[PDB]
Design a binder for these strands. Structure first.
Ligand SMILES: [Mg+2]
Ligand SMILES: [Mg+2]
Ligand SMILES: [Mg+2]
Ligand SMILES: [Mg+2]
Ligand SMILES: [Mg+2]
Ligand SMILES: [Mg+2]
Ligand SMILES: [Mg+2]
Ligand SMILES: [Mg+2]
Ligand SMILES: [Mg+2]
Ligand SMILES: [Mg+2]
Length: 1105
RNA sequence: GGUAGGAUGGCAAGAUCCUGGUAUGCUGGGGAGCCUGAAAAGGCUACCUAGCAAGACCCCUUCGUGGGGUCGCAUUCUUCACCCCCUCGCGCGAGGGGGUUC
DNA sequence: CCAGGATCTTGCCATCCTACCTCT
């Protein structure tokens, strides 16, 4: 079975692709391309418009389900409490729309004397407050909510705006009181802002907070004189909220101790470890050399950094006052970036941060927790560390001292430095003890405390272990399929080459502005961090830093309309929204008021500003452009300029264009994680080395091996000047992987130097031995790639999605239409009947000797009969009676008393009937709702051959010829076609071109076509396999940059894409030599029929068993 | 030494999920106001209320077409088949995962 | 949208380790 040869593996990752090569070798030269293939994956994306992954959509749906389930349980507990109290909950129907609001208003205004009426109004109000309670921090308890200032400043500003807007003053002016007053005074007023799409205004502008509803509840209990235990139980039932939790398996494991969880940043062991490691990395000047700090100097600096309350010790202070050095610059190896006026020495040394937080909390709360203050001063650092570990790991889903419950609530309300560190608590304590006692650094402490050697590297994940990142998992699944198939074919690889997504070929001024930008970012982030710790934000997130930056930048106003905003009612609006692919980069983030954010919604900003009467486009662009530079802000001059241009360019767009910036993080993560798992495979399988090379070393290798993708695959120019990029053809990933199999480190250094020389703005051949042996080894690589591409041995393949999982139907429920039994029945109304047995009865009426509905969508099928009684299996309909019908004449299923359209088609079943010399073809397009209502979403079901009933939307909206042929007993299923199946038209190409395809084939003779969809009953959507789609996107964008940068072939490609080939099923499946190609992991077509999807010719496919 | 990789700590910029909430929206049931109406019933603006993938599994029950709980859109060659790994871990065939070469 | 937890990438600063090439 295995034919072992010496071969190398090249791995070239991409965001939507991965190129994998198995290249058999000689002593240093390539011998044969064993397999080269570009695998085109979706990056996990199931939301093509938004870019959100399938895992992200599943997680948001699951969390919405969990929210609804917890809300239902909480409301049931409230209903039990109201039944205990004798308070009547708000009824489901037959009450006024304003009964709850007037209940809240009256209970806030005057004492209700009537006993049953007061209980009814209290039940109405409390049930309505539980349904609409406002937002609170989920990490804060109900006691913290009671500790909040009531009402919030947002509601006080909203109430001031309402008293100004309506010239009245309600007392005490609660949310229910103002809402009832406005719903009675100005009927039809909306309360909260919503998305715009003749117009009106809204009553409230900010997000309702839970302290506002809590304060209204306290005001109602104060007016009505309710007992305190009663209102405390009511507050517990209304504002009950499940605390957020961290699953323990979501926390990584310690590499030195693989059973233990990674320690939190809050741990005092980590704070000591960071201090001792930072001190152990410092050096001291000694006669043009450097020495490590001696053990007494280590102890002095370490005790000065441990015994610290705040950031008071700079590295200059460590050099001068602690080390007693004559000069500041004698302290070398300071772990900061250097700058003017000794910036690195002016940066601050680390300290015990958790001990500072706990000591400051004690100093502010001596009377609140004096027992804890005495106990904290009493305990040693081991029990202190165990306390701190318990306080840090309370957030884990899955306190050693009998403390009072108020002290427990104050301690769990304490804010500690979050984040995980690399090691566990035991490992950190052991390493710290070894570094303190032996006077060694971290590497020697690891060698001592664990017995590891100098070659020790942390354990790496195996190939079967996923990461949880969708793009990385796509690349890894493709890689492990390729590696298993290649290992069983040719044995294990001799070495493995992975391309990392790292680059360094930049000019010195680019490095200078990046260093100055980093300096400015750190300085402004430190100042804003100090302001937020002064303001109570103990641990500012990057979102908090962005929010404080834009509050400072726009003088606490909204960016869009200019309304004054606070910290708590402002919102960080994605200017390009998340549902249009917008990123969390700070140029995409605008500070808003919440009302502007809700009214903009998911729309582009320029279109929203055109439609809206609240903001103006020119005013927002002008307000951005008049921002002026100052002394010390976050951006540099050039960064402030580019920030203004990128913000303005985001504010100016009118369509839902794709996002400008794409995720290079998942490219680097895919390369790094695939390298780690390939290293695990190499440890298991005896691979000699796993080598890594930069992104710009492979391209420089390809351009110095006289290989260009245009010349290799006979591509044409698509630009008027110069030559286009190599990304037109999808096979360039496999060519990149083939080139990667050749590279060695010395050649990598020389091509990196050549690239740095070239981008340092002809052409000098690089001067080195390693380049010369690489060229003499790889002179035949060009001939080998030409011979491989001429036979089309390089494959572009898309992995199939065959599992019947995903959205069963479209999200929006739709109201049922209706049609009288004894009236005229057309074809579209007969195809829309909701009830399957009523449907089958109408088919029995039109055609008793038939099982399907073979009627035209426009023809009048049944006449208007006043004596037509549809006899059901259990009922008789009347001619006056009406039938539920689906609203529109497309595939639909009934969902929860409404109608939902079916989702995208899971597959098409290919049917072939007629003569063998001239067959007829059709597709039974089957969706996930078809299998859902056919009961096929269970165990032991082949979804591509399991029979569907005639009332499913597959058989309802099949073609008339297909329906008549299955009725006649001539059409049997011969295969299936998922979106992503490759069609091979043979070496002769395709003949049925006309109009746009004929012009496409004069520049692009494409024989390989990928199914993307099934638009209607006689059309299959095909795109060329070999040509990219993002390439077509950037060509169509770059057409309008200059007056006709493109050539004629570029215009042909841009006017073929993105609709590509809207084919015709009975035309394209009758091509001679057409084969539906199902490939193996090595890009080779699977032809032997086993238990995996095989290749099949539609013209000569035998019928299904 | 220089280049490249890896560790740890720091700084900066981002990505990916996960947990809990808010508000909207959709559909069913309602209705406060307004309009067109009325021997002749529907819309509009809000608001209230239930549900918000189809469904699966467990427990009820002082027996019901329902109450309660846990889940259900990922891992993209479904199912079947053969091999492998971790867990039902006695060379057990039941849960998850992985591979099947043209 | 909100708070906040977890995983990870890239780039710089410091330290340690590894392999590898290039000169003298
Ligand atoms: Mg590449
Ligand atoms: Mg809720
Ligand atoms: Mg609520
Ligand atoms: Mg509203
Ligand atoms: Mg927004
Ligand atoms: Mg690539
Ligand atoms: Mg409403
Ligand atoms: Mg609602
Ligand atoms: Mg449900
Ligand atoms: Mg498989």
């Amino acid at each position: 079975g295995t034919v072992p040869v010496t071969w190398r593996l090249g791995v070239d990752v991409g965001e939507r692709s991965i190129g994998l090569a198995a290249v058999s070798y000689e002593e240093d030269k390539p011998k044969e391309i064993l397999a080269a293939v570009s695998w085109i994956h979706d990056g996990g994306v199931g939301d093509e418009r938004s870019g959100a992954s399938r895992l992200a959509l599943r997680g948001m749906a699951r969390r919405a389900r969990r929210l609804r389930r917890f809300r239902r349980a909480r409301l049931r507990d409230l209903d039990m409490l109201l039944s205990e109290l004798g308070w009547t909950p708000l009824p489901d129907k037959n009450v006024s729309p304003v009964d709850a609001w007037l209940a809240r208003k009256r209970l806030a205004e005057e004492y209700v004397v009537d006993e049953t009426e007061r209980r009814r109004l209290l039940g109405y109000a409390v049930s309505h407050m539980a349904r609409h309670r406002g937002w609170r921090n989920p990490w804060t308890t109900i006691k913290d909510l009671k500790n909040l200032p009531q009402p919030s400043d947002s509601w006080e500003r909203t109430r001031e705006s309402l008293e100004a807007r309506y010239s009245v003053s309600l007392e005490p002016g609660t949310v229910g009181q103002w809402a009832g007053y406005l719903l009675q005074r100005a009927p039809g007023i909306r309360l909260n802002p919503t998305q715009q799409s003749l117009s009106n205004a809204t009553a409230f502008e900010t997000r309702l907070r839970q302290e506002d509803v809590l304060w209204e509840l306290r005001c109602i209990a104060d007016v009505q004189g309710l007992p305190e235990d009663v209102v405390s139980n009511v507050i517990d039932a209304v504002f009950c909220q499940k605390r957020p939790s961290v699953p323990a398996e979501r926390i990584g494991r310690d590499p030195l101790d693989p059973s233990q969880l990674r320690a939190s940043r809050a741990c005092l062991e980590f704070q000591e470890y960071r201090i001792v490691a930072a001190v152990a990395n410092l050096r001291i000047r000694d006669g043009s050399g450097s020495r490590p700090l001696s053990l007494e100097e280590r102890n002095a600096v370490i005790e000065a950094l441990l015994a610290q309350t705040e950031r008071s010790l700079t590295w200059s202070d460590i050099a001068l006052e602690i080390l007693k050095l004559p000069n500041e610059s004698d302290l070398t190896s300071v772990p900061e970036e250097d700058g003017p006026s000794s910036l690195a020495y002016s940066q601050f040394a680390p300290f015990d941060e958790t001990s500072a937080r706990i000591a400051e909390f004690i100093a502010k709360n001596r009377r609140k927790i004096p027992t804890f203050a005495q106990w904290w001063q009493e305990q040693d650092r081991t029990s202190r560390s165990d306390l701190v570990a318990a306080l840090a790991d309370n957030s884990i889903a899955g306190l050693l001292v009998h403390l009072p419950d108020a002290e427990l609530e104050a301690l769990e309300g304490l804010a500690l430095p979050s984040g995980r560190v690399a090691y566990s608590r035991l490992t950190l304590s052991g390493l710290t003890r070894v570094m303190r006692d032996d006077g060694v650094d971290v590497h020697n402490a690891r060698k001592t405390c664990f017995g590891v050697d100098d070659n020790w590297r942390p354990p790496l994940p195996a190939l079967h272990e996923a990461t949880g990142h969708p793009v990385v998992d796509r690349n890894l699944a493709i890689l492990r399929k390729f590696l298993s198939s290649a290992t069983m074919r040719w044995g294990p690889p001799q070495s493995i080459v992975v391309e990392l997504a790292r680059g360094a070929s930049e000019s010195r001024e680019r490095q200078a502005e990046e260093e100055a930008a980093r300096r400015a970012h750190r300085k402004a982030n430190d100042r804003i961090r100090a302001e937020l710790r002064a303001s109570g934000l103990s641990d500012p997130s990057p979102a908090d830093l962005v929010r404080a930056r834009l509050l400072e930048l726009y003088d606490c106003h909204c960016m869009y309309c200019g309304a004054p905003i606070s910290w708590e009612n402002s919102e960080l609006d994605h200017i390009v929204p998340r549902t249009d692919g917008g990123s969390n980069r700070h140029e995409n983030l605008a500070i808003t008021c919440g009302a502007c954010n809700k009214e903009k919604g998911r729309r582009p900003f320029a279109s929203w500003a055109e439609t809206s009467n609240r903001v103006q486009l020119r005013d927002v662009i002008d307000r951005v452009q008049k921002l002026k530079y100052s002394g010390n802000m976050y951006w540099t001059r050039d960064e402030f300029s580019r920030y203004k241009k990128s913000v303005v360019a985001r504010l100016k767009r009118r369509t839902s264009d794709p996002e400008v910036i794409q995720s290079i993080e998942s490219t680097g993560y895919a390369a790094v994680a695939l390298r780690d798992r390939l290293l695990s495979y190499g440890e298991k399988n005896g691979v000699a080395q796993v080598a890594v090379f930069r992104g710009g070393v492979t391209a420089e290798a390809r351009r110095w091996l006289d290989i260009s993708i245009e010349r290799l695959f006979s591509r044409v120019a698509i630009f008027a000047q110069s030559t286009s990029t190599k990304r037109l053809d999808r096979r360039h990933h496999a060519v990149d992987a083939v080139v990667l199999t050749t590279l060695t480190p010395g050649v990598a250094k020389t091509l990196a130097d050549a690239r740095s020389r070239r981008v340092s703005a002809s052409t000098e051949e690089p001067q080195s031995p390693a380049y010369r042996q690489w060229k003499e080894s790889c002179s035949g690589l060009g001939d080998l790639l030409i011979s491989t591409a001429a036979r089309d041995s390089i494959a572009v393949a898309a992995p199939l999605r065959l599992r019947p999982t995903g959205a069963l139907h479209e999200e929006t429920l739709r109201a049922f239409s209706e049609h009288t039994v004894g009236a005229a029945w057309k074809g579209a109304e007969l195809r829309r009947i909701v009830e399957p047995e009523v449907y089958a009865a109408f088919l029995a009426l039109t055609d008793p000797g038939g099982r399907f509905l073979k009627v035209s969508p426009s023809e009048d099928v049944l006449p208007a009969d006043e004596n037509r009684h549809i006899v059901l299996s259990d009922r008789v309909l009347g001619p006056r009676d009406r039938v539920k019908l689906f609203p529109d004449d497309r595939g639909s299923i009934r969902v929860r008393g409404g109608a939902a359209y079916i989702a995208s088609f899971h597959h098409a079943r290919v049917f072939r009937w007629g003569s063998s010399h001239s067959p007829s073809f059709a597709l039974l397009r089957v969706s996930l709702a078809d299998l859902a209502v056919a009961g096929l979403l269970r165990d032991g079901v082949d979804v591509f051959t399991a029979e569907l009933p005639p009332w499913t939307p597959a058989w309802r909206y099949a073609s008339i010829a297909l329906v008549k042929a299955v009725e006649s007993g001539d059409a049997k299923q011969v295969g299936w076609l998922v979106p992503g199946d490759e069609l091979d038209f043979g070496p002769e190409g395709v003949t049925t071109a006309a109009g746009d395809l004929s012009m496409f084939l004069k520049y692009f003779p494409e024989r390989h076509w990928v199914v993307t969809g099934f638009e209607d009953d006689k059309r299959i959507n095909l795109k060329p396999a070999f040509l990219s789609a993002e390439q077509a996107e950037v060509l169509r964008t770059e057409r309008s940059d200059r007056p006709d940068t493109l050539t004629e072939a570029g215009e042909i490609l841009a006017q073929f894409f993105p609709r590509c080939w809207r084919a015709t099923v009975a035309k394209v499946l009758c091509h001679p030599g057409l084969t539906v190609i199902r490939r193996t992991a090595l890009g080779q077509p699977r032809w032997r029929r086993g238990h995996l999807p095989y290749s099949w010719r539609p013209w000569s496919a035998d019928p299904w068993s």
